[PDB]
Amino acid sequence: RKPVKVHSRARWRKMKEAKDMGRHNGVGRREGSREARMPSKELWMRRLRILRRLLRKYRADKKIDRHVYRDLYMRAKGNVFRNKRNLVEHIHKIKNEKKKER
Amino acid sequence: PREIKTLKEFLAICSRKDARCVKVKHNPSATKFKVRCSRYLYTLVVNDKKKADKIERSIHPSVKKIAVTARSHAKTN
Amino acid sequence: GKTVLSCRKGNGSVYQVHGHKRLGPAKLRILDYAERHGYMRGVVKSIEHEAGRGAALARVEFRHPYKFRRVKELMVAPEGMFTGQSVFCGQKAPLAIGNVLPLGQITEGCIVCNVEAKPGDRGTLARASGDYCIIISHNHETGRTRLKLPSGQKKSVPSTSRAMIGIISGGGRIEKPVLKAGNSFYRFRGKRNCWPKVRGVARNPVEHPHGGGNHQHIGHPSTVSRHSPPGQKVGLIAARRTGRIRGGKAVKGAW
Amino acid sequence: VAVRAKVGSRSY
Amino acid sequence: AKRTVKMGVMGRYGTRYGANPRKRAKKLEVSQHAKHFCSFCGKFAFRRKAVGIWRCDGCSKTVAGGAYTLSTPNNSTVRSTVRRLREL
Amino acid sequence: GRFKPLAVKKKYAKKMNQNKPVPYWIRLRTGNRIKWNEKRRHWRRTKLNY
RNA sequence: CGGGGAAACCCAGGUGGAGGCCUGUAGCGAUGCUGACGUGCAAAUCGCUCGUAUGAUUUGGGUAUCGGAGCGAAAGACUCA
RNA sequence: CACGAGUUGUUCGGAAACUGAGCACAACGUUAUAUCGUUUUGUUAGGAAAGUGAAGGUGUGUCGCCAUAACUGAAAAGGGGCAACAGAGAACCUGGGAUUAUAUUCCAAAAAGAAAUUGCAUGUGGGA
RNA sequence: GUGGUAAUGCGAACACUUGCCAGGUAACAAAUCAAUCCUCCCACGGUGAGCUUUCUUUUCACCAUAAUCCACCUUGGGCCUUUUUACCGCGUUGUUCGGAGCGGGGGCUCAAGAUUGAAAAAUGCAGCUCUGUACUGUCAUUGUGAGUUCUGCGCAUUAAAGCAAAAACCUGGGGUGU
RNA sequence: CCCAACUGCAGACCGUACUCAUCACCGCAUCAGGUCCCCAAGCAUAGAAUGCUCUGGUACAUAGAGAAAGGUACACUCAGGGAAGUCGGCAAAAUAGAUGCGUAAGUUCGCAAGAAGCAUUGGCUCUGAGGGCAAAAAUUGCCAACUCAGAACUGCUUACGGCGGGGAAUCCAACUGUAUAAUUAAAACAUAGGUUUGU
Ligand SMILES: [K+]
Ligand SMILES: [K+]
Ligand SMILES: [K+]
Ligand SMILES: [K+]
Ligand SMILES: [K+]
Ligand SMILES: [K+]
Ligand SMILES: [Mg+2]
Ligand SMILES: [Mg+2]
Ligand SMILES: [Mg+2]
Ligand SMILES: [Mg+2]
Ligand SMILES: [Mg+2]
Ligand SMILES: [Mg+2]
Ligand SMILES: [Mg+2]
Ligand SMILES: [Mg+2]
Ligand SMILES: [Mg+2]
Ligand SMILES: [Mg+2]
Ligand SMILES: [Mg+2]
Ligand SMILES: [Mg+2]
Ligand SMILES: [Mg+2]
Ligand SMILES: [Mg+2]
Ligand SMILES: [Mg+2]
Ligand SMILES: [Mg+2]
Ligand SMILES: [Mg+2]
Ligand SMILES: [Mg+2]
Ligand SMILES: [Mg+2]
Ligand SMILES: [Mg+2]
Ligand SMILES: [Mg+2]
Ligand SMILES: [Mg+2]
Ligand SMILES: [Mg+2]
Ligand SMILES: [Mg+2]
Ligand SMILES: [Mg+2]
Ligand SMILES: [Mg+2]
Ligand SMILES: [Mg+2]
Ligand SMILES: [Mg+2]
Ligand SMILES: [Mg+2]
Ligand SMILES: [Mg+2]
Ligand SMILES: [Mg+2]
Ligand SMILES: [Mg+2]
Ligand SMILES: [Mg+2]
Ligand SMILES: [Mg+2]
Ligand SMILES: [Mg+2]
Ligand SMILES: [Mg+2]
Ligand SMILES: [Mg+2]
Ligand SMILES: [Mg+2]
Ligand SMILES: [Mg+2]
Ligand SMILES: [Mg+2]
Ligand SMILES: [Mg+2]
Ligand SMILES: [Mg+2]
Ligand SMILES: [Mg+2]
Ligand SMILES: [Mg+2]
Ligand SMILES: [Mg+2]
Ligand SMILES: [Mg+2]
Ligand SMILES: [Mg+2]
Ligand SMILES: [Mg+2]
Ligand SMILES: [Mg+2]
Ligand SMILES: [Mg+2]
Ligand SMILES: [Mg+2]
Ligand SMILES: [Mg+2]
Ligand code: NA
Ligand code: NA
Structure with a gap:
């Protein structure tokens, strides 16, 4: 029984390393639409799931109370925070204001 | 297949009239006693090598004891 | 020539009712001794929709009057009927919506549906969605009730005929424009093979009296006699008038 | 993966 | 923000059935x-x-209600009439 | 395909059995007129359609 | 979720995924070249081009309606070239 | 072309054994003429189409009631069938060195084996 | 028959029951999102093969576990008990839910899984040995991403469209028996 | 007689080869036509487009020699002009992806619209941003997958495949649909709407 013919993936792996470093993905290399390459629904789902997970962790850890949690939950559903860092900054600002008032 | 845990249950299964033969399987870590009954194959697993060897003896000599070994193609057609 | 389409449909053929998804005929209870002398109490168990019918149907459960079993009636539901409602049918049933009473036991001016033209035919009048009858007057010399039909005609039926209190459910259906040929496709999917409709003047003269000509026109008056043989009786059949009516709409039908 | 790869670091 | 000015749920129909039939169906x-x-x-x-x-x-x-609304005006009138006839 | 009724299978079996050459010793008989079967059937020429 | 407004309501950013919606495969068709062929691969095919492609969509198998009759979103179309 | 071979099943597909769009035997009616019509909107036929058997009585066997045979019946309206190898339903699945050709179909005592399911029976263990 | 406040649990008389009734299963449904078996890819190691002026800790292949059972940590539903001045809170990518009982604690149960074993290595596949369909001995990779309609999934879609029925089977209600 | 754990015996009938098609079916044939269902790899790419490839399959289509004219092509190019050709821009050419700006009359307010237009696209080396899981935890450690931006350097012969030309109007039909199998796809038919008639 002769062996199967070779179908090598070395070229593809070198190209994959290059594309990991950021090569070969520019304006002239894109054939599909932006939403085809990276749907906005997928990005929104990821961002909102991150925000809700962070809010649940903060509520369970008692860094925020249930009222601040509800306000931030509705604001996160309302596209107020661009990423996790923006939400964390808002939380810290609210906590500082509460500390001053208290 | 049914797993029997107690040596008493193993003796009861071996005492049955439908116990055609007993297959002794020697694994590197344990010994298995597979009893070919009418409907189910009952297996007794013994971790202790010495206790397993003791169990292998004092089995009813009426039953047929099979030493499970790999059988090659030339060995069997 | 060849047989006109209006005559071919009388053979049945591919023009019959699409009844596979239908639930069966909708009727009142059998007019029995309990109805005639007392009343039967039923429970509305479900309110279902049948293909090809604009009005809702009600499944009402009664105890069998003579055996140890339960009987489920399928009635045309009046508007306001709900699951779990108690439905009373008989002589002594109270005057309330959803109850079935003899016409003579119903006071004048009451709105009724599912009217029996004959005593015991289990409801043949005022059955389409949104339709109802009006009880005009009771005559005791003849023992007949005079009621107003949905078409505007007034007919007299025996006071022992039964009717339901209220209007038929599902009213207002024809107030919504269809907007699409596909919607008519789905509407007539549950009824029969009658859609789309091809005009007579769009056909050839071999198959329709209106067919033919170098222009699309009826070359003869479309008002045809009542005595025209089949194949010839197309168009406006035995019309008393034509045009845009122009005034009070006369009550259609015979005298 | 966690840190983006550098061409220069390929030396070592 | 508001996505259409005048037609709401009828915006699914594009431009292709007429303003007034769309208005009536809306x-x-x-x-x-x-x-x-x-x-x-x-x-x-x-x-x-x-x-x-x-x-x-x-x-x-x-x-069991109306075709596109839970209760038709005729139904309310009939309910009031039947109640009044019961009280008579 | 796989499905056939047994009656059809037996008709096909009989037609398979009839699809033989004439024995040689038939041609040597006295007054013989038969040379070939002349009712030989090939599956690619004429169809039984059972 | 914001921003205005006394109110009525209005203005913006997201989310969402509607439609006999669009570009396009398969599929289902057949516009033009009046292209090929036109004793053909073919008693209607081939090539490119082209229509539509979630809908009144396409399709298998079963059923039902026929000869002055049947069936037909209608061309006297189709009903085993 | 000639000769000689090859298709293996409790579990796979079908039938046994479901209903559907439907068909149309009986029945009735019609027709000079059945080679015509009706025959699922729970359903044939002016139409007496059930041959089954709840409880009783009597007898056998089983026990301390159950099963079995007979006489009197409570109840059960609406005759008999077909129509799906893609709907319903359906208890087997791996390994093989087991072929020239079949295999979830062949393999034989270490069944290469491991099961799942029917029907009927015998003991065992409990109740009648 | 028998436990538990309850959701509901318990199998060798918790016996029978189409005499008779009443329910279930059979049984049917979009899109979004999350997806199972499985496929592909990457990482990590083993075994063999390939290439090797030079380079490539490299290229390629393989690394499997059927039905049937036994025992019993996640995910998603339904529900029970308690606290219930709970009205703002919970939650989804998403068009919502709550005194007709949200949320929290603790449970009951269902569905899909995971895991422990029996089957099962005695099999399969690669080489390898050396001494003929031979024979001994070695291997026989456990973690991720992208797809995947099994599933969650329905009183479930546009709807003047609302998505077959039966056999067969499963429970109960009464009853018999006990 | 009933039950539930076993056990013993027995488990009947038919199908089963092969094919399912550029040769096994229909088309007079091993006919470029037609014919239902399941499984469906790698790379590029939005990709079941298209191009190439490992596994499986195939090298079967009468061939050899071979720059006549004239042909067919699911083949190209042509200086200068640019529709003067022709009934007619028929045919061909042309436009193309993605991204950022920008987009008129008219309008049933939905569209028109990809209107029209104007820019940028390579390679390489970098820099930011976007997460998961553990123990002012606003901190410490580990770790995966892809992207989207910005920057410098360095290039183009503008260089695979695939992939709208656009605008100003007139006449018809509202639209999506259907339709003369084999010369007519339309303005015809249908269609929402509208109106009559019988009952
Ligand atoms: K005419
Ligand atoms: K869409
Ligand atoms: K016919
Ligand atoms: K005929
Ligand atoms: K509350
Ligand atoms: K056309
Ligand atoms: Mg979106
Ligand atoms: Mg018309
Ligand atoms: Mg015409
Ligand atoms: Mg004509
Ligand atoms: Mg005429
Ligand atoms: Mg005209
Ligand atoms: Mg006219
Ligand atoms: Mg076949
Ligand atoms: Mg042929
Ligand atoms: Mg045949
Ligand atoms: Mg469309
Ligand atoms: Mg389109
Ligand atoms: Mg031509
Ligand atoms: Mg020629
Ligand atoms: Mg196409
Ligand atoms: Mg031959
Ligand atoms: Mg032969
Ligand atoms: Mg007959
Ligand atoms: Mg009938
Ligand atoms: Mg039927
Ligand atoms: Mg009758
Ligand atoms: Mg049958
Ligand atoms: Mg089936
Ligand atoms: Mg079977
Ligand atoms: Mg074979
Ligand atoms: Mg066997
Ligand atoms: Mg359901
Ligand atoms: Mg397994
Ligand atoms: Mg789904
Ligand atoms: Mg076979
Ligand atoms: Mg075969
Ligand atoms: Mg095939
Ligand atoms: Mg050929
Ligand atoms: Mg022929
Ligand atoms: Mg062919
Ligand atoms: Mg392709
Ligand atoms: Mg491709
Ligand atoms: Mg190859
Ligand atoms: Mg040729
Ligand atoms: Mg060749
Ligand atoms: Mg030139
Ligand atoms: Mg040029
Ligand atoms: Mg030039
Ligand atoms: Mg120019
Ligand atoms: Mg000119
Ligand atoms: Mg000229
Ligand atoms: Mg052109
Ligand atoms: Mg404008
Ligand atoms: Mg324009
Ligand atoms: Mg543009
Ligand atoms: Mg038009
Ligand atoms: Mg369309
Ligand atoms: Na079904
Ligand atoms: Na037209």
Whole structure:
């Protein structure tokens, strides 16, 4: 029984390393639409799931109370925070204001 | 297949009239006693090598004891 | 020539009712001794929709009057009927919506549906969605009730005929424009093979009296006699008038 | 993966 | 933000059935897809499930009603009339 | 395909059995007129359609 | 979720995924070249081009309606070249 | 072309054994003429189409009631069938060195084996 | 028959029951999102093969576990008990839910899984040995991404469209028996 | 007689080869036509487009020699002009992806619209941003997958495949649909709407 013919993936792996470093993905290399390459629904789902997970962790850890949690939950559903860092900054600002008032 | 845990249950299964033969399987870590009954194959697993060897003896000599070994193609057609 | 389409449909053929998804005929209870002398109490168990019918149907459960079993009636539901409602049918049933009473036991001016033209035919009048009858007057010399039909005609039926209190459910259906040929496709999917409709003047003269000509026109008056043989009786059949009516709409039908 | 790869670091 | 100026749910139809037929169908569509008050259970939870069938999300009660609204004006008049005739 | 009724299978079996050459010793008989079967059937020429 | 407004309501950013919606495969068709062929691969095919492609969509198997009759979104179309 | 071979099943597909769009035997009616019509909107036929058997009585066997045979019946409206190898339903699945050709179909005592399911029976253990 | 406040649990008389009734299963449904078996890819190691002026800790292949059972940590539903001045809170990518009982604590149960074993290595596949369909001995990779309609999934879609029925089977209600 | 754990015996009938098609079916044939269902790899790419490839399959289509004219092509190019050709821009050419700006009359307010237009696209080396899981935890450690931006350097012969030309109007039909199998796809038919008639 002769062996199967070779179908090598070395070229593809070198190209994959290059594309990991950021090569070969520019304006002239894109054939599909932006939403085809990276749907906005997928990005929104990821961002909102991150925000809700962070809010649940903060509520369970008692860094925020249930009222601040509800306000931030509705604001996160309302596209107020661009990423996790923006939400964390808002939380810290609210906590500082509460500390001053208290 | 049914797993029997107690040596008493193993003796009861071996005492049955439908116990055609007993297959002794020697694994590197344990010994298995597979009893070919009418409907189910009952297996007794013994971790202790010495206790397993003791169990292998004092089995009813009426039953047929099979030493499970790999059988090659030339060995069997 | 060849047989006109209006005559071919009388053979049945591919023009019959699409009844596979239908639930069966909708009727009142059998007019029995309990109805005639007392009343039967039923429970509305479900309110279902049948293909090809604009009005809702009600499944009402009664105890069998003579055996140890339960009987489920399928009635045309009046508007306001709900699951779990108690439905009373008989002589002594109270005057309330959803109850079935003899016409003579119903006071004048009451709105009724599912009217029996004959005593015991289990409801043949005022059955389409949104339709109802009006009880005009009771005559005791003849023992007949005079009621107003949905078409505007007034007919007299025996006071022992039964009717339901209220209007038929599902009213207002024809107030919504269809907007699409596909919607008519789905509407007539549950009824029969009658859609789309091809005009007579769009056909050839071999198959329709209106067919033919170098222009699309009826070359003869479309008002045809009542005595025209089949194949010839197309168009406006035995019309008393034509045009845009122009005034009070006369009550259609015979005298 | 966690840190983006550098061409220069390929030396070592 | 507001996505259409005048046509609401009728925006699904594009430009292709006429302003007035769309306007007439709009009111009945909006009514037939709305949540209607349930006299039982006191909730705004009545939804249409096929023409003339209204089921409440709260108490799970199913009612026979109008084609595109839970109760027609004729039904209210008939209910009042029948109640009055009962009291006579 | 796989399905056939047994009656059809037996008709096909009989037609398979009839599809033979004439024995040689038939041609040597006295007054013989038969040379070939002349009712030989090939599956690619004429169809039984059972 | 914001921003205005006394109110009526209005203005913006997201989410969502509607439509006999669009570009396009398969599929289902057949516009033009009046292209090929036109004793053909073919008693209607081939090539490119082209229509539509979630809908009144396409399709298998079963059923039902026929000869002055049947069936036909209608061309006297189709009903085993 | 000639000769000689090859298709293996409790579980796979079908039938046994479901209903559907439907068909049309009986029945009735019609027709000079059945080679015509009706025959599922729970359903043939002016139409007496059930041959089954709840409880009783009597007898056998089983026990301390159950099963079995007979006489009197409570109840059961609406005759008999067909129509799906893609709907319903359906208890087997791996390994093989087991072929020239079949295999979830062949393999034989270490069944290469491991099961799942029917029907009927015998003991065992409990109740009648 | 018998436990538990309850959701509901318990199998060798918790016996029978189409005499008779009443329900279930059979049984049917979009899109979004999350997806199972499985496929592909990457990482990590083993075994063999390939290439090797030079380079490539490299290229390629393989690394499997059927039905049937036994025992019993996640995910998602339904529900029970308690606290219930709970009205703002919970939650989804998403068009919502709550005194007709949200949320929290603790449970009951269902569905899909995971895991422990029996089957099962005695099999399969690669080489390898050396001494003929031979024979001994070695291997026989456990973690991720992208797809995947099994599933969650329905009183479930546009709807003047609302998505077959039966056999067969499963429970109960009464009853018999006990 | 009933039950539930075993056990013993027995488990009947038919189908089963092969094919399912550029040769096994229909088309007079091993006919470029037609014919239902399941499984469906790698790379590029939005990709079941298209191009190439490992596994499986195939080298079967009468061939050899071979720059006549004239042909067919699911083949190209042509200086200068640019529709003067022709009934007619028929045919061909042309436009193309993605991204950022920008987009008129008219309008049933939905559209028109990809209107029209104007820019940028390579390679390489970098820099930011976007997460998961553990123990002012606003901190410490580990770790995966892809992207989207910005920057410098360095290039183009503008260089695979695939992939709208656009605008100003007139006449018809509202639209999507259907339709003369084999010369007519339309303005015809249908269609929402509208109106009559019988009952
Ligand atoms: K005419
Ligand atoms: K869409
Ligand atoms: K016919
Ligand atoms: K005929
Ligand atoms: K609350
Ligand atoms: K056309
Ligand atoms: Mg979006
Ligand atoms: Mg018409
Ligand atoms: Mg014409
Ligand atoms: Mg003509
Ligand atoms: Mg005429
Ligand atoms: Mg005209
Ligand atoms: Mg005219
Ligand atoms: Mg076949
Ligand atoms: Mg042939
Ligand atoms: Mg045949
Ligand atoms: Mg479309
Ligand atoms: Mg389109
Ligand atoms: Mg030509
Ligand atoms: Mg020629
Ligand atoms: Mg196409
Ligand atoms: Mg031959
Ligand atoms: Mg032979
Ligand atoms: Mg007959
Ligand atoms: Mg009939
Ligand atoms: Mg039928
Ligand atoms: Mg009758
Ligand atoms: Mg049958
Ligand atoms: Mg089937
Ligand atoms: Mg079978
Ligand atoms: Mg074979
Ligand atoms: Mg066997
Ligand atoms: Mg269901
Ligand atoms: Mg397994
Ligand atoms: Mg789904
Ligand atoms: Mg076979
Ligand atoms: Mg075969
Ligand atoms: Mg095939
Ligand atoms: Mg050929
Ligand atoms: Mg022929
Ligand atoms: Mg062919
Ligand atoms: Mg392709
Ligand atoms: Mg491709
Ligand atoms: Mg190859
Ligand atoms: Mg040739
Ligand atoms: Mg060749
Ligand atoms: Mg030139
Ligand atoms: Mg040029
Ligand atoms: Mg030039
Ligand atoms: Mg120019
Ligand atoms: Mg000119
Ligand atoms: Mg000229
Ligand atoms: Mg052109
Ligand atoms: Mg403008
Ligand atoms: Mg324009
Ligand atoms: Mg543009
Ligand atoms: Mg048109
Ligand atoms: Mg279309
Ligand atoms: Na079905
Ligand atoms: Na037209």
